[PDB]
Structure formats: structure tokens, C-alpha cells
Ligand binder design. Structure first.
Ligand SMILES: Cc1ccc2c(c1)C(=O)CC1(CCN(C(=O)c3cccc4cn[nH]c34)CC1)O2
Ligand SMILES: Cc1ccc2c(c1)C(=O)CC1(CCN(C(=O)c3cccc4cn[nH]c34)CC1)O2
Lengths: 693, 693
């Protein structure tokens, strides 16, 4: 017992497994729930400093398999786990779910055979994943492991005999390995005959049983661990599409552990805790040479956060847990429940302060969440303090996160107008290599940023089930050699696919200093998913196929200007100057630019409305809210009557509005619906009068 | 008329549009069907040199929109198209479908406003895409274009007036652009008032109508072309998941044209015909500098074939058409029809000749399709001449294509054991840059090869609807710094996702000199998709978590060998040599290797069977054939009874076999089913006795 004379019991002595975990620089698995209690309690504090919280706000029940392999809740001593995988069901009252929401936490035990995945761990992880999926609820995975479990048949180590070519000269080889009759008998003795596959051949003297295959009595040595690995890889692929999935990397995550991190998509990596496939010793031992000094060179945050495998980093375990709790605060309590409304003091009903100018450089984040000034806070488009940026280490020409809009949680995607200096480090395996600077111009989709954009749309849709706003402001894709070689069209096309799959409302909005040209517009037009998408342009946006320089280059050429210098008298009167080129070219540029305006977009039927930035918060608040309400009714009509298109479903529902409701007044439509949900419900129950063959 | 005194009419004079296309180095659009007739006729020739083919074997009917926008078939003069997009419905008798199969060919007209996509082209392309999708039939797109259509309001060019700061000194700017009352009247005169948005302000002298926005009378100038672009981008995303899609790039494909190429996935690029986003003049004009000399530097085959955007190249248009026809020969006639059986002279019932050895280097393609020797043809695993490699320009450590197995068409994926020297060219925009050689070790998944593997699985599943065989032989993923930075875990995880989605039979087979280790096995284990996947190991395969060097490094350490030198007398008798290390280490290596055997895999329940290569063709022929037959019955049972798992569906169907059928004899089960399809049909019709609420 050490230290002595402490005020309360030494928890690291009561259960030495807790000391072991600490010695490995991670939280002991059975203490994680307390981190979730601490994190959940900080959420309430940050939401409402004066709320009275008791311990009944938060409950963690460990899940174990009963005798039939069915998951049950138990309360027991930390460290009684007979497998190296453990899980808890948490029921917590949160600001978004003040009567409670649930989720599972599954976690390796790094103290149990080094957190290795053997068959039983893989089976339990899989049962836990299905438990959550069946229930609709989020699955949090706390990754701390050494990959698949390995081993030899240790019983065979002291028994085997090597059949030498030349007995007293071992030097020039052996023929095979074998068992004597006392080997065979020692095995039969312990009921381990199964451990080995033998071919009998008596060579001169005696019977030698030849080892043809070593099997082993002990489960968890090889391919059976690989089978379980793939089971939980597929289980996690599937869960991503089904529930909110997230992982926290808190000691090494290795092999299957690294795959699990990526497969669950959403990942938070504690600094200094690597995500690796193979360790540096093994890699080095295979290159002869000592290329690598640290597993952090292969999968630290400087690899994975810079990659987009790690969506965030965290300074320690609690911080990562708080980032999880925070990320969940935007997400339905379970699959297909409504997105959690959270109204804060920043209420919908205000103008938007921070307005960008073409003159001046800006951080797009100011437009999103607003900006601190010396004259005080300039409010952005979304609720103050509500912006939770993710994938912030990678592809920095796009900005992604969650935010709230008068309380409505949504995915947000914006464009970074500033040039990214993407510094790529040298490969220590290549002595030739130097660190490389890639400069990434703003408003320009590169392969990284296109990949990030599609990834974001997918991660908003799947599990999060969030509506979305894209603050679209791209000049196009980089069509140069390097970017085209590096497969920009592939990543770009993923954006289309992502939109086609989207199941919640989407708003595309070209902001006040913004543009959408050419390739850019293709990938984001609402006809890609008319059921869910709408587009809007700020009165101070531009759009069309080419920029003005581009358009004049093709349709206001050197000879068309000249004809236009019959707006001049000096030139007019010279038939039977030409250093007004400077300004006649500016005139052509301006003539092109006059096509590229929101008024043209409206005229042409390509946007639902032109907008005013300062008024955009109010507009979108009621638009989005009206959309959520109508989607809810489309869904009810769909759980019921059966076969009709979206267009017939929305027209039936809208035929139910009072004749004086203006179908195009968002606030009115939302208001009427919310006053009459239960009356509508009555109507829907009547429509379940369905002899439909 | 030129030339004169030709034997038959000059087709390029009869329709000068044909001369124009030729002048642009492409086939005139209305002559493509004849290429499909020529290609289809060569298929029959290569299949059966002595078949009598008449012209009624092949029919091309042009599809136009009638007055209601509904697609109808017409026969008319080439060159009467009023839009720059054209389409044909082809009904051809082929060796796989000797009574005929159908598909649509949609194509830009490069002679019609440079093959530009305006709204009407985009609308027609979309209607054609849905026509095919509704019918289930393949959509071939022949891409020859200049991207979205552009334009200014040309009526406004001669009318506009510039409001100078200083009239007789143009030099220091203008304030705006405007229309006089005679401008306004000239517009009203032609019914083009709409063309422009004006604000009236009388400045000293007269009324100036200020141009606030130019709209234009002429459709097809800007954003309305971008709307149609996104419509057909989404339409093509959707079609990929629905029907066989393929594209041939035959003049430039630009902007939306390039996206369409990628979105349809399967692409064949005629040499010298670029796939670009923005042209080199525009790119250069924007860099000031002249970086690029050729659109081929940005999207020629040396970019796109090397990328995997272009699955194949073709030497000219006909060759590309033949590659299409050939690719289709593996594919159902329409969605959800059975895969097309084509038995050739290489019949199932033979051993496999080409066998790889660990001693000698081999091309895995020899194992697939076989090999020409001086002693004559050594047959591979699949039908002689049946192997159609795709994505052969990219990620060459995997080998992908279609093949046939006793006539059964399937996707095949194999591993290239030879090192790839992936030479990456220099970026002409970066004066610093040199060409780089990447060496890619064999049996090692890199990000490119993992991406290719997942892409292939997806492209076999979607539209092709093919079963698949993977000849799995990977040591693992590259876990070093460069490959981990370049996001290997992302591409690897796509393989898992691809398998989860697969809807036809999958066979995973570790071949005779092969291995599957660690990360590699995770991504391909059949528990990822148990409904469709099965695994097998050759008796001469290896598998487990680590290679033997790896395992001894952890579990046969320096002190465990020493104990094992109580197999020696010289060392034994020394208590109260050590340059038998060389050979005691080899012994440990061998002891590890003895765990890694197919016999262990069987013992452990991880493979369905251990196999013998030479016998593998026969085994898999009946296995696959029995699987197709059972899938067909699972599907019928599913179109009917309603709600049951795959496991209950297969057990019901198998309960219908005669009691003497051995459920595990593939040939017997297949034979019984094929003898009794119509009797089974009778049974299924009886089970439609469903009061199920
Ligand atoms: C590094 C980077 C930055 C911006 C970019 C790109 C690359 C691209 O490759 C596409 C694009 C699209 C808009 N563009 C145009 O519309 C245009 C077209 C033709 C000529 C001119 C001249 N200036 N801008 C032009 C210029 C090129 O935007
Ligand atoms: C360039 C390249 C080539 C092959 C590779 C890789 C990289 C990887 O990064 C993974 C792996 C997996 C199999 N490996 C192993 O199983 C193993 C593990 C531990 C030590 C040793 C020593 N040799 N082989 C070892 C060695 C490493 O295969």
C-alpha cells in the first residue's frame, strides 16, 4: 500500500488495474463514466450556471453478457471484467434532452492483455453495436488497444523435436519438426491432442509423429482473431449509416483498432496517442534500417488530424469526452427522432452584424458565429457560441461544423477566402525528400477540400440526421495538372453523390461577397436533390459559367470593342484613338458582370429568392422551421397511405391548410402546423382507412 | 462538291456536318450506330467465325421528343437535330443474347454549337437517362463537347451607353451603363424589354435608363445552363446505381462533360481526346504566365488513365465502341436479369495448368487467364480469352477485370506480386518540381490500390450486378508515414463498405503462393457480409496476424531459444555453444509458420474449405453455379411471402430438396434445381396464399 496516510482510500491500490492504465497514460476504463458525468455537468453549467443538478441526472449501468450471451445491466466492482472489452449504458439529462437521452460507451480495457482484440472482445463489441443499433441510440467507442491478439501453442514449445539432417552438426539444416510418443502422451494426458496435426513415420530407430500443422489449445492466436476483426469492421461500417457513431482515441489504437476509428467516421484523437496500422519497430525491422523513431511519426495527430481521419484533437481524455458530449448536443436522442432544438439568449429575431466586404480580407467564421470587436460583439448568421468546427486540421479551404439557427441545429459548410499554406512534412524513409509547401487559393476546390465537403455532407446525414446550409462561394475546381492528376473529379463527384443521398433539408446560399461559377455550381445545384434542396443568392453575390475576364475573352473580343468605339467621336470620325483600350476593356468586363447578378438568377428560375444578408437569419430561421414541420408531415403521410411521390404528398398536406394560409409565408405555415399537430394527427389516423391492393 | 468522280456519293458533302466532325477528329454523331453495328458484327465473328449474320440482327432507332416532350422513335435524315444532343435505341442480337438485348446511346453533337450543353440538351440527356433507367437498360454516353453553353445579350451590345465621369476624357472611368429612350424603344420594338433591368434617372439634359442587370432574350447564356448541368450530374449519379453506365470520350469533354465522365464511373478515353475542367489557355491567362501548352497536359490519357478516371484508352472511336460492346458482354441485358452465361470451348471440366511457385516471379494474369508457352497454352483458372482487364493504367499493384468461369461472368480481383515503378511526372506550374518514382511493393495495399479495389467491387455490384472472386494475397497495408499521411485507412475502409453493399455472390480465395495477414484479412473476411461472402484457402496458402519474423520477434525471443537449446547436448551439458543462433532462429520461424496453415483455418472455422489450385476451377464452377441458383430462389421467396431473414429463406428452400440431396454437394443441388425450376415455381405460386397482417 502506497502512498500511506492519504485522506481517502487509494483507488490505484484498491484496484491496481487503475494504476496500470495510468502507467500507460490513459484513463482506467471503469473511471470513464465519471468523465461523462463530469462532462455532462459542465454542459449544464455552461448552459445555465444556476441549475440545480443532482446525481440522478446521470446514470451509468455496465452491460455484460448473461449465460445466453444476452446483454444485461449489472453493478459490480471495477476490474471484474473477464474479457478485455467493457461497455456502459448512460442515461443523462442534458439541456437538449432535459428528461434524458441514452447512449452506449464501448471500450477496450488496456490492462486486459494489453487491450488486444480476441474473439470474445470482438463478439462483445459486435453485440454492443447491435444493441445500440436496434435501439437507435449513439455508440461511442473508446479506443485503447494493441490490435488483434496473437500467440503460439505454448504447450508445444517444450515438446517439439527437430529432425536434423546431421545430428551433431545442426548447422546444415533440419527436415521437419516432430513429436515423440511421450510428446503425444503428454498431450493426450492434458486433453490437448487436437493441438497438433501429426503424420506418423518410423525412421530407423523410432516412431516420430511429424508436425504438419500447429493448432493450439488456446483460442485467440491467429486467424480466428482476424475473423472477429472483420466482423466488427463490417458491424461498424453498418452502424455509421444507422446511428450516431463516434470514437475517442486514448491510448494507441492499432490494426483493427485504427480501422474501427476510421469506420465509425467521427474521431477525436488525444494528443500523443497514435492511430497506427503497424508500429515503427516492426516497420524498421522490416526495412533493416531504423527509419522511424516514434509511432507518432506514423499516426500521431500531425498525421491524422492533418489527414482528416481525426476530426478533432484533445489535450487529455476528459477534454475528448467533453468534445463528444458537445458533438452529441446537435444530434437526435435516437434514430429518426427530431433534431434537438436548443434556444439560447441569441434569439432568431435580430439582424446579422458581421458583413464581409470585397475590399477587405475576412475569416468566414465571423460570418458564421460572429466576431469580437473593440466596439463589442458583431453577431454572425448563427447563434452566438453555437459553432462547433470539425475536420479543422485538414483541407482548410473549407470550413465545416455544426451550429444553431434560433436554436435549430444544422450542419454548416463555408469557404475560406484566405490562401492555405499547406505544409507537408518530409518522409523519413526517403533521404531525398524535403518538406513541401502547397499553397491552396481560396474559393477553389482542391481534391482535399472537395473530399472534405462530401465527407461533411455525408457525416451530417448519417446518424446526425441534420439539415444543412452551404455558404457556397467557389470560383471552381483547380483544373490544373497537379490537381487533375490527383483526381479532383473523383472527389468532386462524391459531393454530388452525397447530396443525392441527403435526407433532411438543405439550403444553398451564395453569400454577399460570394460567387459560384462553372464547375462549382454543377456540384451544388438543387436539381441534384429537388426533394431536399433549395438555393438562394445574396443581392451582392455573383454567378454564371465564367468570370467576366473569361466571358470577354470569348464574347467581347478585340474587334467587338472597336465597333464599340463608335461610342467615341475622336474614333467614330475616322473612316472612308486606340489607347482607350484600358477603359473599353473595363467596360466589357462590366457589361459581362451585369449578367452575373441575382436578378438574372431569379429571372431565370435558378434560385428560390434573392436575399439580403442582414435579413438572412430571420428569413432562414422561419424557412428552416417551416421545412422541418412539412417534412414531418410528409413522413407521417408516408408511414401510412403508401405509394405517392413527394410532390403528391406535399400537395395533399398543403391542401389541408386553411384557405387563408399563404402557402409561401414560412412563419405562418409553421405557426399553423404547430398549433394543429394533434388535429393533423386526427386527420392522418382517419386516412388509415386503407383497402389499397 | 469535292472530290468529284467518286464511285458512290460523298457523304461529307451530302451532310457537311459530317465533314465538320471529321475536321475535329471525331466521328459524326449519326455515324456512331454504324460503329456499333460493325462492333457487334465483330463480336459474332470472334465467337463463331461461320455464323450467318443479316442486318436484322441490329437495329438503331433515333429517339426524339415529341410535342409533349415524350421520347419517340423516328427515322430521319442525319443532321436534322434541332438540339445538340442526340440519342438512339439499339436492339442487337449478341452471343450472350442471341434473341437480342437493348440499350441507349446518348451523344453530344460536336457540330451543333460546339457540342455545348444548354438547357435543352441537358433536359434531353436527362429524359434519355430516365428512359433507360425505367426500362432497366444500359446507358452509353458518347462525350464530345465544350461544356456549358455561354453567351451575352447580344441585342444589348449595340444599344448600351456608358455614362462617363468626364465625356471627352474617357480615361478616368465611367459611373454606370445605360439606355436612351431609343434603346428602350428599339427593345420594346422587338418584344425584348425583358432583356434588361433599368432604373430611370434624368441627369441634366435627358432620361437615362440605367442598366441594373442584363438578362437577355436568348436562353442559354449562364446560370440556366449551370442548373441543367447539375440536373444531369445528379441524374448520372443515380443511374450509376441503377443501370449499366458507361461513357466514351471522343473529342474533348469539358466541364460538365468531364463530370459526366466520372459520374457514370466506367469510362474509355480515345487517345488524344482530353477530359478537362478548364482549358490551358484559360488557366494560363489566369496565371499571366504560359504554364501549359496542351489540354492533354491537364486531362489526356496520361492524366486520366494513370488516375483511374479512364478505365481504358482506345486508339480510335471504333476501338472504344468495341471495348464498350465487349464490356457489356459480361453484363445482364437489363437490371435484375441473370448474368449472361457464355460457354466457350474452354469448358469447366479441366484442371488448372499455370501454377505459381515461391521460387519464381509470376504475372498473376497467368493464374487468371493462363499463359502461352513454347510447349503450348497453360490454362489459368478462368475461361481462355475471357479476361477483360479494366483500370489497367492505375494502381497497378491490383489487377482488376471481368472473366468467365465455365461461361459464368464475374468480377475478378487479383494481386500483382511484382514491384510497380509508379513514375509521376513533374508539374509544369512548379519550376522546382521533378518527376518522381514511387516504388510500390507487391502484396501491399497502398492508398491507390485500396481505392482501386473498392472501386472495382463497387463497379461490379452496381449495374454490372456480377458475382465476384477475389484472389486475396496481401501482406497488409503500407503503414509507413507517407502512406498513412496519404490516408490509406480511408481507402481501406471503402473496401469494407463496398463488401457490405454487395448483392451477388462473393468468393474470397487465398491462392497457392499466397497470404493474407493482419490488416489485410480484416477488410475481406466473409463476416463482413455473410449473406453473400465465403472464404477459401489453398493448401499452399499462409495466413495469420503477423508473418513468422513478426511472431518470433514477440513470442520466440532471445531467451526462449536458449531454453530450446536443451535440444542440444553440447549446450545442454553446461549448467551448475551459442552460434547455433542462425539455425535455432530458423527453427522458431518454422514453428510460427506451422500455425499459419490452411489446416488451422479449417480447424478454427474461418474458411469454408481448404482447396487444391489445380482442382479449383471445377470446384468453383459448381459452387458459383449452385450459389446463383439458390440466390434466385431466395429472391423469389422474397418477392412473395414477405418478412424473413436470409437464414430462414434458405432453410425453407433447402427443406424443399429431396431428402437424398446432399445439401453440400454443389453440382447435385444445382442440377436438382435446374431440373425443377418450373416445379418450384408451382410451389412458390402456392405460397402466395398470404393473409399476413
Ligand atoms: C488556381 C485556380 C484558381 C481559380 C480557378 C481555377 C484554378 C480553375 O482552374 C478554374 C477557375 C474557374 C473560373 N475562371 C474563369 O471563369 C475564367 C475562364 C477563362 C478565362 C479566365 C480569365 N480569368 N478567369 C477566367 C478561372 C479558372 O477558377
Ligand atoms: C512496405 C511494406 C511491405 C509489407 C508490409 C508493410 C509495408 C506494412 O507496413 C505491413 C506489413 C504487414 C506484415 N508484417 C509483419 O507481419 C511483421 C510484423 C512485425 C515484424 C516483422 C518483421 N517482418 N515482418 C514483420 C510486416 C509489415 O507488410
Amino acid at each position: 500500500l502506497r502512498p500511506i496516510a492519504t485522506p481517502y482510500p487509494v483507488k490505484e491500490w484498491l484496484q491496481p488495474k487503475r494504476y496500470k492504465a495510468h502507467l500507460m497514460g490513459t484513463t482506467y476504463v471503469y473511471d470513464f463514466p465519471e468523465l461523462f458525468r463530469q462532462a455532462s455537468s459542465s454542459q449544464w453549467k455552461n448552459f445555465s450556471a444556476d441549475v440545480k443538478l443532482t446525481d440522478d441526472f446521470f446514470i451509468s449501468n455496465e452491460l455484460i453478457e448473461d449465460e445466453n450471451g444476452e446483454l444485461t445491466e449489472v453493478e459490480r466492482e471495477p476490474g471484474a471484467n473477464a474479457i478485455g472489452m467493457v461497455a456502459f449504458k448512460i442515461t443523462v439529462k442534458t439541456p437538449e434532452y432535459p428528461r434524458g437521452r441514452q447512449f452506449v460507451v464501448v471500450a477496450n480495457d488496456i490492462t486486459f492483455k494489453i487491450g488486444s482484440f480476441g474473439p470474445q472482445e470482438d463478439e462483445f463489441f459486435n453485440k454492443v453495436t447491435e444493441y445500440a443499433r436496434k435501439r437507435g441510440i449513439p455508440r461511442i467507442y473508446l479506443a485503447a488497444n494493441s490490435g488483434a491478439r496473437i500467440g503460439m501453442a505454448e504447450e508445444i514449445v517444450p515438446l517439439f523435436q527437430v529432425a536434423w539432417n546431421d545430428a551433431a552438426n545442426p548447422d546444415k539444416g533440419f527436415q521437419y519438426l516432430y513429436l515423440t510418443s511421450e510428446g503425444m502422451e503428454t498431450l493426450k494426458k492434458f486433453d490437448k491432442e487436437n493441438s497438433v496435426l501429426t503424420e506418423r513415420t518410423v525412421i530407423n530407430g523410432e516412431e516420430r509423429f511429424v508436425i504438419k500443422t500447429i493448432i493450439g489449445s488456446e483460442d485467440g492466436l491467429g486467424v480466428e482473431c482476424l475473423r472477429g476483426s472483420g466482423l466488427i469492421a463490417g458491424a461498424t461500417s453498418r452502424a455509421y449509416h444507422d446511428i450516431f457513431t463516434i470514437t475517442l482515441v486514448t491510448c494507441r489504437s492499432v490494426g483493427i483498432g485504427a480501422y474501427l476509428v476510421r469506420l465509425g467516421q467521427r474521431a477525436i484523437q488525444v494528443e500523443g496517442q497514435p492511430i497506427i496500422l503497424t508500429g515503427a519497430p516492426a516497420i524498421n525491422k522490416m526495412l533493416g534500417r531504423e527509419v522511424y523513431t516514434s509511432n507518432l511519426q506514423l499516426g500521431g495527430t500531425q498525421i491524422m488530424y492533418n489527414n482528416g481521419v481525426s476530426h478533432l484533437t484533445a489535450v487529455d481524455d476528459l477534454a475528448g469526452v467533453e468534445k463528444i458530449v458537445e458533438w452529441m448536443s446537435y444530434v437526435p436522442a435516437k434514430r429518426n427522432m427530431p433534431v434537438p432544438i436548443l434556444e439560447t439568449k441569441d434569439t432568431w429575431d435580430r439582424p446579422v452584424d458581421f458583413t464581409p466586404t470585397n475590399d477587405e480580407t475576412y475569416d468566414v467564421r465571423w460570418m458564421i458565429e460572429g466576431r469580437e470587436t473593440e466596439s463589442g460583439f458583431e453577431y454572425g448568421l448563427f447563434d452566438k457560441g453555437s459553432f462547433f468546427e470539425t475536420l479543422s486540421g485538414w483541407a482548410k479551404g473549407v470550413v465545416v461544423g455544426r451550429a444553431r439557427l434560433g436554436g435549430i441545429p444544422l450542419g454548416v459548410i463555408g469557404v475560406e477566402t484566405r490562401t492555405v499554406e499547406n505544409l507537408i512534412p518530409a518522409d523519413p524513409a526517403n533521404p531525398n525528400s524535403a518538406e513541401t509547401l502547397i499553397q491552396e487559393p481560396g474559393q477553389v476546390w482542391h481534391p482535399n477540400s472537395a473530399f472534405k465537403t462530401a465527407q461533411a455532407i455525408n457525416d451530417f446525414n448519417n446518424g446526425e440526421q441534420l439539415p444543412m446550409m452551404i455558404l457556397a462561394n467557389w470560383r471552381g475546381f483547380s483544373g490544373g495538372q497537379r490537381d487533375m492528376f490527383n483526381e479532383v473529379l473523383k472527389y468532386g463527384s462524391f459531393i454530388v453523390d452525397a447530396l443525392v443521398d441527403y435526407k433532411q433539408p438543405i439550403i444553398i446560399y451564395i453569400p454577399p461577397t460570394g460567387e459560384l461559377r462553372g464547375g462549382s455550381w454543377v456540384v451544388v445545384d438543387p436539381t441534384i436533390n429537388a426533394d431536399q434542396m433549395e438555393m438562394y443568392a445574396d443581392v451582392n453575390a455573383r454567378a454564371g459559367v465564367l468570370e467576366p475576364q473569361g466571358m470577354v475573352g470569348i464574347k467581347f473580343r478585340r474587334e467587338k470593342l472597336l465597333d464599340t468605339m463608335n461610342r467615341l467621336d475622336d474614333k467614330y470620325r475616322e473612316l472612308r484613338e486606340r489607347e482607350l483600350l484600358p477603359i473599353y476593356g473595363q467596360i466589357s468586363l462590366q457589361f459581362a458582370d451585369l449578367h452575373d447578378r441575382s436578378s438574372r438568377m431569379v429571372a431565370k428560375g435558378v434560385i428560390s429568392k434573392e436575399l439580403e444578408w442582414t435579413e438572412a437569419r430571420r428569413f432562414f430561421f422561419w424557412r428552416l422551421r417551416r421545412r422541418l414541420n412539412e417534412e414531418y408531415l410528409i413522413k407521417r403521410l408516408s408511414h401510412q397511405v403508401g405509394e405517392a411521390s413527394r410532390l403528391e404528398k406535399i400537395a395533399r398536406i398543403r391542401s389541408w391548410y386553411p384557405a387563408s394560409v399563404d402557402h409561401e409565408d414560412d412563419r405562418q405555415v409553421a405557426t399553423w402546423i404547430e398549433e394543429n399537430y394533434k388535429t393533423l394527427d386526427d386527420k392522418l389516423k382517419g386516412l388509415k382507412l386503407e383497402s389499397f391492393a
